[PDB]
Structure 1
Amino acid sequence: GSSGSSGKSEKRMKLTLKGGAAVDPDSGLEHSAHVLEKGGKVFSATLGLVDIVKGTNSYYKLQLLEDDKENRYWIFRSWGRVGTVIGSNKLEQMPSKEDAIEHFMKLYEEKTGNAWHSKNFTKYPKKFYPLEISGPSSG
């Protein structure tokens, strides 16, 4: 036996099929949703904090995933010590894209303490900072 076939035909009518950053597999939206990109930017920030006294090392990750089905979004939040028994994540669906951005903007604003879209970064006590820094501004 044997057979084959193929085709190609579509009408682009208000559709933005594209991505940017990679999504976490633990989110289960890596094969469904994708990193929420805005203003030619990516909603993928990697913060890290480690006490010198407590000798405890922490790491906070933030990623705003966007549903590429109809119109939905989730809010991924990872936290826990560095290489330990700890390790937990949070996944919640957002009502509106904004509600997702706001949270993602406030969340990253709570850890670091500074607004996501803010200039000048003050290394506060406990406040988390950006680990892997790349691109213009800051660093």
Structure 2
Amino acid sequence: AVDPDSGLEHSAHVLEKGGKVFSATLGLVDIVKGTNSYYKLQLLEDDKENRYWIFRSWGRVGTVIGSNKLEQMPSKEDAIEHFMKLYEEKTGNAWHSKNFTKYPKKFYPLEIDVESMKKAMVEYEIDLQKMPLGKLSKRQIQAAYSILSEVQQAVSQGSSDSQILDLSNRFYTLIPHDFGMKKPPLLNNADSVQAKAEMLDNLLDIEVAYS
């Protein structure tokens, strides 16, 4: 799917090489400094022409701060080289490889798939509130739930608050939220962990329904 901030939502479609959807959404979180940043990267083909563009977008999740850049690449192949170069520069790990190794201060990829309208608009806005960067994959949501179990166990242990910080960072990176400008909160409270657990349960039910 194409991004609208580029102005080519109807003019183009995302290029692909079978299983290489040239469209990535990366996120990085660090609570000790209160950063929760996203990065959209796309390589767009024309709707049907030999014209190919590169789109980059960044900022804080669910917040206005952040600009974008749409640059015209010369041909339909060197654009892929620029794509891979920026992917590695921002994540560390390669564009296509089984090794999803995290790197310090480097992003991590995110797997993605009548008065009725007056209220449907509000419903879709709250949908975006729950999913500030869009729909997620069941793999990553289940990984988030397993990390939630890890956090529940580490809080039951009541020890190693540094591990609590690390797990909270991993989670918030795996599950974005619209904190606005507020520093992401730690996950030391049993009530907070159970609340986000039931939130994930509702979301997982909604996703298994969508089939």
Question: What's the offset of the Cα at 1:122?
Answer: 1.3
Query: In 2, distance between residues paired with 1:71 and 1:131?
Result: 29
CA displacement 1:50-84 (0-9 Å, x = unmatched): 11211111001111111234311110111011233
The equivalent residue for 2:89 is 110
The equivalent residue for 1:132 is 111
Question: What's the offset of the Cα at 1:121?
Answer: 1.7
Question: What's the offset of the Cα at 1:86?
Answer: 0.6
Query: In 2, distance between residues paired with 1:105 and 1:131?
Result: 16
Give SS of 2:6's match: coil
CA displacement 1:19-71 (0-9 Å, x = unmatched): xxx10111111111110111343111110001121111100111111123431
How many residue pairs get matched? 113
Query: In 1, distance between residues paired with 2:4 and 2:49?
Result: 21
Question: What's the offset of the Cα at 1:132?
Answer: 2.8
Give runs of ≥4 in structure 1 deviating > 2 Å.
none
Query: In 2, distance between residues paired with 1:131 and 1:36?
Result: 19
* Percent sequence identity over aligned pairs: 99
Query: In 1, distance between residues paired with 2:7 and 2:111?
Result: 24
Query: In 2, distance between residues paired with 1:132 and 1:42?
Result: 11
Aligned pairs for 1:1-139 within 5 A: 22-132=1-111
Verify the 8 A CA contact 2:93 2:102 in the aligned structure 1.
Answer: no
Verify the 8 A CA contact 2:42 2:56 in the aligned structure 1.
Answer: yes
Query: In 1, distance between residues paired with 2:7 and 2:63?
Result: 23
Of Structure 1 and Structure 2, the greater helix share is in 2
Query: In 1, distance between residues paired with 2:19 and 2:36?
Result: 32
RMSD, aligned α-carbons: 2.5
Query: In 2, distance between residues paired with 1:85 and 1:93?
Result: 25
TM-score (norm 1): 0.74
The farther-off stretch of 80-89 and 28-37 is: 80-89
Query: CA 1:117/1:25 → structure 2, altered by over 3 Å: closer, same or farther?
Result: same
Query: In 2, distance between residues paired with 1:41 and 1:125?
Result: 25
Verify the 8 A CA contact 1:106 1:115 in the aligned structure 2.
Answer: no
Query: In 1, distance between residues paired with 2:42 and 2:67?
Result: 14
Question: What's the offset of the Cα at 1:85?
Answer: 3.9
Give SS of 2:60's match: coil
